[PDB]
Amino acid sequence: LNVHHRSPRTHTMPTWVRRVFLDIVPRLLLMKRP
């Protein structure tokens, strides 16, 4: 829940989080973004 409610005005997303959780894990769990 804490992660779900973050925004640019309060938090910054590290590049490694973006990489992992938007490419690697989603592809490994058989869920693909639009």
């Binding site: 640019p8 005005r9 309060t10």
Partner: peptide
Amino acid sequence: QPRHH
């Protein structure tokens, strides 16, 4: 704080 804007 980001404070981007």
